[PDB]
Design a protein around this ligand. Structure first.
Ligand SMILES: NC(=O)C1=CN([C@@H]2O[C@H](COP(=O)(O)OP(=O)(O)OC[C@H]3O[C@@H](n4cnc5c(N)ncnc54)[C@H](OP(=O)(O)O)[C@@H]3O)[C@@H](O)[C@H]2O)C=CC1
Ligand SMILES: CCCCCCCCCCCCCC(=O)SCCNC(=O)CCNC(=O)[C@@H](O)C(C)(C)COP(=O)(O)O
Ligand SMILES: CCCCCCCCCCC1=C(C)C(=O)C(OC)=C(OC)C1=O
Ligand code: SF4
Ligand code: SF4
Ligand code: SF4
Ligand code: SF4
Ligand code: SF4
Ligand SMILES: [K+]
Ligand SMILES: [Zn+2]
Lengths: 360, 114, 208, 340, 48, 176, 291, 41, 156, 43, 95
């Protein structure tokens, strides 16, 4: 049972997403991104949206940037509930899975209220978001965030000081810093090893320079410091949601360049130019200027990037999707050396893999 | 016309690599019939290997046959290690497919393809 | 142009232009172009014989320290005689910066594998073998990574169609999943969407 | 010819083969592979089913969407038969039982229901009707199966004169009751045989040969009104046939003579079960009936079907009956049986 | 709807139906268009 | 702006050493975990009694598709094919011609529900609010081809669910 | 243009017109660009379109219920930049993003007009012109544009043979080719001939010519009579438009003899009118006094 | 050296994985697409 | 007759015991398995219906194909379905398992799992909600309830 | 206008830190209880 | 106003019905052909022609942003009514 070689064959979920993106327009290529990291949906939407907006040379309105960061931290809570609870389920603590998926169910209700779908919203779009917040949503987000800390507290009560949880994760999967940078790791996989790097601080996007939070830094590079980094990122995500609920500005939620974002339906049915722009944006779409960008954001699994190549047409020429899980699952073979099967399952837990973004 | 090689300087080393690869497949086929428990004879699998080698027998470019040796070694590694299954090995035996119309008359009868 | 237009970061544009001059004059053996985009991204277009000399520079040079390999990508552009465009995306955590190192190959020229510089590429260029057909010389374990095991052809080449040449189904005669030639019950409806009117005069090419 | 039934496409799963088939008894051994080989051509297959719809589940992935229409039918009800055949351009008859049940006998299965299906298909305008008899069908045969199947062949020929009536010898496949039957007398004892099984000769035919024969009889206009005899290429005595079965499966083959008056008492001992019986005296009479030679009838070679011998498909059938200690041995690691 | 009734129409179903899948009242799909190419009808007279 | 998770050194006076030794020998954190699990034993579970109790939904919810009509009986779909031009999976197939009064209407309006990705681009691209993605989500079938809706099935979905779709559009249409 | 409206007023509604069964007219969409009038005045030579009115009530039309029936009357559907002049048979049927544009040739006349057949899901939707400076500059006749719906009626789809009662019945290809070749094997010499039609490509022509040459038959005819007295069809110069279609732009005097080129070869007549208009061509006609 | 002299014709048909039916029996059409006469651009 | 009544009540007993003790298997593929975990979550709670996972195919009763079936895993799907003892059932969850879905025209995707396994219940959505999946499971229970196994045995 | 907005004074303070409340006895008390139970059982 | 073919099969509002000799009726055997009996072409004839006193009228179908885009309809022809392109509601100038 001592592991001598790991060969993870992948591509069992290779759907050929980023060839299907080439034959569809940018708005049609947006819902492919929801299904890559399918526990981090609006973060992938936000990364693709920032890539398209960077090529379009336009910026979102401020309220849509605050809504993007609010639902990005809700999305980070979703992914870290998934990560921690299924890592513990794959170790054996199967009960806080059931404890935290009710909270995850409530955040899926928040998605279903703001966008109409529980998981795959196609809500965060190039130009802002699709639709404004419904009335009464933010008060329920406050009533959720008021109580979520007790849930993190009781998860941390069940696992953090537990000796059986420590004996499965403390000497397991140690990653040195130079081999972490060499393997192209990102996110918690660096931050468990002590590499002070977070793209919401260092290379900040929409309004992450306007919210103050902390970045948890691990000390031993093991599964247990990465566990504590994910629990503390749930804490800090509650902190950023408090700051975003207090600091939500009024205004619109799409870019008012109506050759990019569609007009309202109240003005599409009255104005001529708005009808022409609605027609041409929902059939041809907006033309992105030629050029290539690499826009990467801090998704809750790490550096999630889009390398987007446009040829001036209304469709992408190339769209490479850099996932963190690809490089993390590459480094699995080094991380699993000297361990056993019951430790390699903890290593695959602490490398939180969603294979839709690993395989595309 | 001054190009960079992959492995072979010319066609002699290239034919050496094709020859070694056919040696490796010829040694491999009885194990492939045995541990995949294929219901074909060993001669039938060796003739399929000979058919898959004679299919590419018209190439005169050393780089292309270097890549064919490379891809054949990749399929050989997928066959030695049990990474293919019984389906992936029997996909070289197009058995569920109908015999396509060969002459002009039956292709005329069934459809429009030349 | 304040609310709806992206603001321009001229400081990062100037800094990346100066570092592009720096890299172009340190390594003129391989560096072909250096260009800085309007949203301040740097591209070092090199020769495919300088993969290992340039990337070991940017991994190790004390003014570069691009210690992270973000992404490795090929792009098929069939109208060039070297139709594949290998793209190295690099992150310097010291200088909080990103760089792009682009090179080129056709189907038959090997590109030297950059696993000696960044081990992260051990799967990425492996994927470039799987998706595009670019062979990487002196790679440790080069095989397919995403396609099916008996998959012929290279998917992300633009001469390869969207649906492939085969499709799978279960067959109860042979009790086995079989591959047949693909027949769609509905053809993928190709939409001609390009407008005949020019959208961007600044990107206008000269005529013949 | 109607415009919706013109053959289009390249003969794949989603194509239009122009064949609208009502396959009676498609939930069995021949109907499995028949609906397989039809639905891969892109045919509209109507499957009337008597059984549970769960027992029809394996017929659902065999074709494209809407190409297999399941519908209820009763053999003692012409209304459901006319409900099934009224749109088809070919009806295939695969209704059969090796044993007679509480409500059905061999005359209901082989004389009543096939004449009903052929008569209703005649009076609904179905051009092509395929009936499946047995090669050893005879009025004076010792087994009630072959007697009622000869009577049913006569009735189908007289009430549908353009019918293609097909004679298979003894069909083997994965789901057969011929090589599996010969396998499963390592449970009971030492595989008893009438006169050591050396006074009867068999030429068993492979099931995909029979299936390609049925489909090439559908596509052939010259197969209308013929009578085909589908036999395998090699004739075997029953002794070395059973010896080759027990040599592929690597079981201890120790035969012994059981007389004719006592090997029917074993036949009535297993047909007193209310379930599907393990054997019967009719199966005793038909394992020990020689496969007759009818050279005047056309065969698989006259429909373009190359007959597959037993030494290619017997490993495919009989790998299931092996123990682990000889489970992975090959097709060539056995001496073939002696032909005649 | 006892307090805020729905907006009544002439086409809204007065008889709501539950899920009919598996029953003889189930949806069977079909092409909702007519025949595209009209075929030639040969004349019903002798050519002599 | 960063914090060190797990950089605590334990106290080495005899009091804290005896406290950790009692924690080790007498299993204090194990009793803490048992206490938290026993605390959840005595709670009301979140299990709603499906099918009698339903999960809460919004008037933005995207379920089964339906073709709407004007409040006179006339259907809304004027064959403009924006819904199949923006459909990210090409689930919508439209064939049209002028009908017997010269009106621009469809003869074929097919939605393949087994290609459909339920993202609602068709209901936001429709200029006349004809195609919508209504509130029904309990429409599982026992056969694949029952999930290939023609124009008749979609108009019957509209006629079935109109008394709810009109109210949900009335609740949401100012946000659109 | 801009992306929104400052127009907070009520729009006009222009009355629709009826100028034929070919051109659906919705004049509210008209932007008064007068490509109608310049086309019908300068290329079609009709002089029956115009602008009646003055100011915002200026209406492009004919002022009366007059039907715009030229042989080129549908080309105003091409050069209407808005949807005020649409193709009435094509109307409401398809949409140009989903149409597949296959570049092909006319066969409705001997002009050989370059066209785009645009289809949709395996069904021909419409026929547009291609640009070609030497044939049809970017126009086509109304027959070329609108005869594609005869291409989907009265079609031959299955091989038919005479039954025993003397009626055409459907049969397979094997029966039809056997019954034709069985009579072809009993013919030899001038016992077998061949009439070539109007719409038959050169591949089928040389196919049937080689087939009847295998029977040793040279009796192969076409429906249109060309006289063989003299050099016949041996030299190519005595049956071609040897100047060119484009050579009318180089000519100064044209003698038309025994023809109505308006309806026999309409875009050749359009090239003659373009030379008449711009190059001061002198045209003389021997024949009936046609327009 | 580190370069070889290949005078052979460039042909990668055995590498692209296309079946023979779509190599030898297809006719590629190379053309500038004609201007849609519905538009002026 | 009495025997028809006895086999009818025994059909009712075995259909009750099979629909009220459905054991699905821990088998998801893509985003639908997250929602299938939400159908296991304490709000919708499959376990109150007797619906509980068993990881081995030998001790599972239904296979919920929850996600996208690619070409590289279709033989693994078929062998996992084959290693389930009869009676075994298939619930197809989501658009990619139903008919190819959002990756329908892809080179690498099996266009619906009904090309591979016989499918009983098609659950539509991208993803279908956990409530819609539980609706499909209860419709599968209603399909098991009206099975006529021993009646058809008694009549054949 | 009407829009989903925070209230005028903002939302309330939200807890986001660790609260593991340090319950239980000390070490010497639990060993005293255990040794006393031993002595009672032994007597 | 749904009608019925001589096969017994109902005719859709398109005009679709399978022929008697068409095998594809077998999909409706034992099951039902789902047609919608509320024909829009029948239900728009039931609407009264709106008599107005203006020359150019406007239609948005009702609801404002709940209907269709607002088009402007000319009522100059005293012979023909003025039909909306979207809703099919027809108008007439009453003089
Ligand atoms: N080796 C062989 O088995 C040979 C067989 N044949 C003939 O070929 C035909 C098919 O053979 P095979 O598949 O092996 O046999 P099976 O018994 O396995 O198949 C019979 C089929 O008919 C149905 N059926 C049986 N009895 C009745 C009945 N009384 N009423 C209605 N349906 C019924 C069965 O379905 P259900 O689930 O409803 O019972 C099944 O689909 C038969 O006519 C047989 O005589 C000929 C030569 C050799
Ligand atoms: C069980 C089934 C397993 C299937 C096995 C699949 C094997 C597929 C591998 C294919 C690899 C090739 O085809 S590389 C061959 C191409 N070589 C060339 O074009 C160079 C010419 N080579 C030849 O002619 C070869 O026959 C020789 C032997 C090298 C020279 O012979 P000639 O001289 O006379
Ligand atoms: C016991 C609690 C319910 C578990 C139900 C698991 C059913 C199978 C889902 C597949 C799956 C597994 C195993 C899984 O562990 C996982 O990781 C979070 C997934 O998402 C990427 C999965 O899709
Ligand atoms: S919801 Fe999306 S995928 Fe479904 S029909 Fe509408 S546009 Fe297409
Ligand atoms: S967008 Fe609306 S009106 Fe247009 S074709 Fe689609 S459903 Fe019909
Ligand atoms: S071509 Fe069109 S826009 Fe121009 S005048 Fe004529 S109708 Fe008006
Ligand atoms: S498509 Fe053009 S002509 Fe038609 S209504 Fe719109 S702007 Fe006017
Ligand atoms: S049907 Fe859609 S949402 Fe569901 S698993 Fe598939 S890709 Fe994900
Ligand atoms: K026009
Ligand atoms: Zn209106």
């Amino acid at each position: 049972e001592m592991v001598r070689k790991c060969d993870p064959h992948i591509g069992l979920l290779h759907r050929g997403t980023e060839k299907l993106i080439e034959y569809k327009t940018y708005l049609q290529a947006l819902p492919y991104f929801d299904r890559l990291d399918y526990v981090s949906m609006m973060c992938n939407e936000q990364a693709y949206s920032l890539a398209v907006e960077k090529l379009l040379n336009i910026q979102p309105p401020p309220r849509a940037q605050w809504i993007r960061v609010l639902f990005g931290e809700i999305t980070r809570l979703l992914n870290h509930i998934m990560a921690v609870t299924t890592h513990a389920l794959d170790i054996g603590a199967m009960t806080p899975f059931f404890w935290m998926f009710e909270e995850r169910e409530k955040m899926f209700e928040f998605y279903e209220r703001v966008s109409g779908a529980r998981m795959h919203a196609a809500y965060v779009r190039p130009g802002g978001v699709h639709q404004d917040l419904p009335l009464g949503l933010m008060d329920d987000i406050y009533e959720f965030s008021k109580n979520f800390s007790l849930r993190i507290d009781e998860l941390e009560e069940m696992l953090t000081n537990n000796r059986i949880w420590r004996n499965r994760t403390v000497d397991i999967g140690v990653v040195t810093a130079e081999d972490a940078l060499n393997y192209g790791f990102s996110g918690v996989m660096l931050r468990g090893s002590g590499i002070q790097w977070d793209l919401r601080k260092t290379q900040p996007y929409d309004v992450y320079d306007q919210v103050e939070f902390d970045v948890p830094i691990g000390s031993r590079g093991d599964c247990y410091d990465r566990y504590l980094c994910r629990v503390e990122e749930m804490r800090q995500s509650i902190r950023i949601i408090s700051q975003c609920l207090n600091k939500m500005p009024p205004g619109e939620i799409k870019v008012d360049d109506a050759k990019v974002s569609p007009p309202k339906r109240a003005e599409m049915k009255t104005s001529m130019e708005s009808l022409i722009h609605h027609f041409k944006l929902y059939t041809e779409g907006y033309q992105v200027p030629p050029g290539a960008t690499y826009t990467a954001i801090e998704a809750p699994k790490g550096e999630f990037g889009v390398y987007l190549v446009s040829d001036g047409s209304s469709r992408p020429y190339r769209c490479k999707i850099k996932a963190p899980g690809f490089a993390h699952l590459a480094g699995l073979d080094k991380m699993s050396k000297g361990h056993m099967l019951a430790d390699v399952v903890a290593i695959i837990g602490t490398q939180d893999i969603v294979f839709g973004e690993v395989d595309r | 016309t001054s190009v960079k090689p992959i492995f072979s300087r010319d066609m002699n080393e290239a034919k050496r690599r094709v020859r070694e690869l056919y040696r490796a497949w010829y040694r491999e086929v009885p194990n492939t019939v045995h541990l995949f428990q294929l219901d074909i004879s060993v001669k039938q699998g060796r003739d399929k290997v000979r058919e898959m080698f004679k299919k590419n027998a018209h190439v005169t470019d050393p780089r292309v046959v270097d890549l064919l040796v490379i891809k054949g070694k990749m399929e050989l590694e997928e066959t030695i290690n049990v990474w293919k299954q019984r389906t992936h090995v029997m996909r070289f035996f197009h058995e569920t497919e109908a015999p396509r119309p060969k002459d002009f008359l039956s292709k005329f009868y069934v459809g429009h393809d030349p | 142009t304040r609310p709806t237009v992206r603001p321009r970061n001229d400081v990062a544009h100037k800094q990346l232009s100066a570092f592009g001059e720096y890299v172009a004059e340190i390594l003129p053996k391989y560096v072909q172009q250096v260009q800085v985009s309007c949203f301040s991204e740097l591209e070092i277009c090199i020769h495919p014989d300088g993969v290992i000399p340039v990337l070991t520079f940017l991994r190790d040079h004390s003014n570069a320290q691009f210690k992270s390999l973000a992404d490795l990508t090929a792009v098929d552009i069939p109208t060039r005689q070297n139709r594949f465009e290998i793209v190295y995306n690099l992150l310097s955590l010291r200088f909080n910066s990103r760089i792009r190192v682009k090179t080129y190959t056709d189907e038959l020229t090997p590109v030297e594998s950059s696993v000696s510089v960044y081990k992260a590429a051990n799967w990425y260029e492996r994927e470039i073998w799987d998706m595009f057909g670019v062979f990487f010389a002196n790679h440790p374990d080069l095989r397919r990574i995403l396609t099916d095991y008996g998959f012929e052809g290279h998917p992300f080449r633009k001469d390869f169609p969207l649906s492939g040449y085969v499709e799978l189904r279960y067959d109860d005669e042979v009790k086995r999943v079989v591959a047949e030639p693909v027949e769609l019950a509905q053809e993928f409806r190709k939409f001609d969407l390009n407008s005949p009117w020019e959208a961007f005069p600044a990107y206008r090419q000269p005529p013949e | 010819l109607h415009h919706a039934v013109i053959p289009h496409g390249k003969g794949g799963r989603s194509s239009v083969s122009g064949i609208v088939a009502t396959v009676f008894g498609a939930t069995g051994f021949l109907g499995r592979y028949l609906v397989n080989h039809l639905g891969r051509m892109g045919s509209q297959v109507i499957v009337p089913y008597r059984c549970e719809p769960y027992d029809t589940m394996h017929l659902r992935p065999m074709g494209d969407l809407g190409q297999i229409i399941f519908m209820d039918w009763n053999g003692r009800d012409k209304d459901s038969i006319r409900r099934a055949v009224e749109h088809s351009n070919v009806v295939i008859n695969l209704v059969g039982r090796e044993w007679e049940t509480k409500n059905f006998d061999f005359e209901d299965v082989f004389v009543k229901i096939p004449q009903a299906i052929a008569q209703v298909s005649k009076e609904a305008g179905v051009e092509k009707f395929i009936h499946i008899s047995h090669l050893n069908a005879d009025i004076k045969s010792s087994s009630k199966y072959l007697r009622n199947k000869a009577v049913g062949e006569k009735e189908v020929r007289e009430t549908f004169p353009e019918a293609t009536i097909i004679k298979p010898a003894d069909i083997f496949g994965r789901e057969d009751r011929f090589l599996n039957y010969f396998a499963n007398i390592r449970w009971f004892g030492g595989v008893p045989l009438i006169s050591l099984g050396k006074k009867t000769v068999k030429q068993p035919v492979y099931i995909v040969d029979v299936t390609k024969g049925i489909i090439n009889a559908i596509k052939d206009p010259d197969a209308r009104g013929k009578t085909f005899a589908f036999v395998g290429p090699n004739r075997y005595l029953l002794f070395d046939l059973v010896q080759y079965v027990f040599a592929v499966a690597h079981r201890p083959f120790l035969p012994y003579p059981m007389p004719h008056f006592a090997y029917r008492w074993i036949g009535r001992l297993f047909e007193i079960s209310p379930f599907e019986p393990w054997t019967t005296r009719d199966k005793v009479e038909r394992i020990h009936t020689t496969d007759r030679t009818l050279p005047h009838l056309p065969g698989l070679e006259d429909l373009g079907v190359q007959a597959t011998p037993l030494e290619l498909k017997a490993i495919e059938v009989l790998r299931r009956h092996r123990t682990y200690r000889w489970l992975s041995s090959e097709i060539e690691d056995v001496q073939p049986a002696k032909t005649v | 709807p006892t307090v805020k009734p729905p907006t009544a129409r002439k086409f809204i179903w007065t008889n709501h139906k539950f899920n009919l899948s598996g029953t003889p009242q189930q949806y069977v799909p079909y092409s909702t268009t007519r025949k595209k190419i009209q075929e030639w009808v040969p004349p019903s007279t002798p050519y002599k | 702006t960063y914090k060190y998770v797990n950089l605590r050194e334990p106290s080495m006076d005899m009091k804290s050493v005896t406290d950790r030794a009692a924690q080790t020998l007498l299993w204090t954190e194990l009793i803490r975990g048992l206490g938290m699990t026993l605390s959840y034993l005595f709670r009301e579970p979140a299990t709603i009694n499906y099918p009698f109790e339903k999960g809460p939904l919004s008037p933005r919810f995207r379920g089964e598709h339906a073709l709407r009509r004007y409040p006179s009986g006339e259907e809304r779909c004027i064959a403009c094919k924006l819904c199949e031009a923006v459909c990210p999976a090409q689930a919508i197939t439209i064939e049209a011609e002028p009908r017997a009064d010269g009106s621009r209407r469809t003869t074929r309006y097919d939605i393949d529900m087994t290609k459909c990705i339920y993202c609602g681009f068709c209901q936001e691209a429709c200029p006349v609010d004809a195609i919508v993605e209504g509130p029904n989500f309990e429409f599982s079938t026992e056969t694949h081809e029952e999930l290939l809706y023609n124009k008749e099935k979609l108009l019957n979905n509209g006629d079935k669910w109109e008394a709810e779709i009109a109210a949900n559009i009335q609740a949401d249409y100012l946000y659109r | 243009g801009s992306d929104r409206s400052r127009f907070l007023e009520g729009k006009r509604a222009v009355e629709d017109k009826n100028i034929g069964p070919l051109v659906k007219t919705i004049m509210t969409r008209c932007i008064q660009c007068t490509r109608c009038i310049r086309f019908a005045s300068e290329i079609a030579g009709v002089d029956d379109l115009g602008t009646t009115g003055r100011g915002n009530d200026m209406q492009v039309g004919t002022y009366i219920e007059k039907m715009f029936m030229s042989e080129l009357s549908g080309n105003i559907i091409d050069i209407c930049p808005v949807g005020a002049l649409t193709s009435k048979p094509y109307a409401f049927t398809a949409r140009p993003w989903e149409t597949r544009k296959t570049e092909s040739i006319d066969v409705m006349d001997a002009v050989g007009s370059n066209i785009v057949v645009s289809t949709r899901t395996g069904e021909v939707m419409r026929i547009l012109p291609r640009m070609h400076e030497d044939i049809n500059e970017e126009w086509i006749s109304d027959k070329t544009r609108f005869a594609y719906d005869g291409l989907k009626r009265q079609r031959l789809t299955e091989p038919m043979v005479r039954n025993e009662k003397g009626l055409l019945t459907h049969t397979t290809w094997e029966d039809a080719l056997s019954r034709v070749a069985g009579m072809l094997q009993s013919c030899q010499g001038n016992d077998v001939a061949a009439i070539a039609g109007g719409l038959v490509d050169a591949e089928a022509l040389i196919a049937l010519k080689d087939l009847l040459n295998r029977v040793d038959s040279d009796t192969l005819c076409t429906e249109e009579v060309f006289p063989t007295a003299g050099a016949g069809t041996d030299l190519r110069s005595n049956y071609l438009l040897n100047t060119t279609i484009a050579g009318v732009e180089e000519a100064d005097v044209v003698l038309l003899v025994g023809t109505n080129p308006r309806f026999e070869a309409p875009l050749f007549n359009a090239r003659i009118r373009k030379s008449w208009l711009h190059n001061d061509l002198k045209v003389a006609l021997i024949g009936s006094p046609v327009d | 050296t580190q370069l070889i002299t290949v005078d052979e014709k460039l042909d990668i048909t055995t590498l692209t994985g296309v079946p023979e039916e779509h190599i030898k029996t297809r006719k590629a059409r190379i053309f500038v697409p004609a201007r849609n006469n519905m538009q002026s651009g | 007759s009495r025997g028809e009544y006895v086999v009818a009540k025994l059909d009712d007993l075995i259909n009750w015991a099979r629909r009220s003790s459905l054991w699905p298997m821990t088998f998801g593929l893509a985003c639908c398995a997250v929602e299938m975990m939400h159908m296991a979550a304490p709000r919708y709670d499959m376990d109150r219906f007797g619906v509980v996972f068993r990881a081995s195919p030998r001790q599972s009763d239904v296979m919920i194909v929850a996600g996208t079936l690619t070409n590289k895993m279709a033989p693994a799907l078929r062998k996992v379905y084959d290693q389930m003892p009869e009676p075994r059932y298939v619930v197809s969850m989501g658009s990619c398992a139903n008919g190819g879905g959002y990756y329908h025209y892809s080179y690498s995707v099996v266009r619906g799992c009904d090309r591979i396994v016989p499918v009983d219940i098609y659950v539509p959505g991208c993803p279908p909600t956990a409530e819609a999946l539980l609706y499909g499971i209860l419709q599968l229970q209603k399909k098991i309830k009206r099975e006529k196994r021993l009646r058809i045995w008694y009549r054949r | 206008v009407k829009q989903d907005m925070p209230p005028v004074g903002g939302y309330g303070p939200i807890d986001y830190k660790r609260n593991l409340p340090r319950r239980g006895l000390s070490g010497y008390s639990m060993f005293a209880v255990g040794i006393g139970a031993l002595l009672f059982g032994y007597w | 106003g749904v009608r019925t073919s001589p096969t017994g099969e109902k005719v859709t509002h398109t005009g679709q019905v399978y022929d008697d000799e068409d095998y594809r009726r077998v999909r409706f055997v034992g099951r039902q052909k789902e047609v919608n009996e509320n024909f829009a072409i029948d239900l728009i004839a039931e609407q009264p022609v709106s008599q107005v006193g203006s020359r150019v009228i406007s239609c948005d179908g009702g609801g404002g942003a709940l209907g269709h885009p607002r088009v402007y309809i000319n009522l100059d022809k005293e012979t023909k009514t003025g039909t909306c392109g979207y809703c099919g509601l027809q108008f007439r100038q009453q003089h």
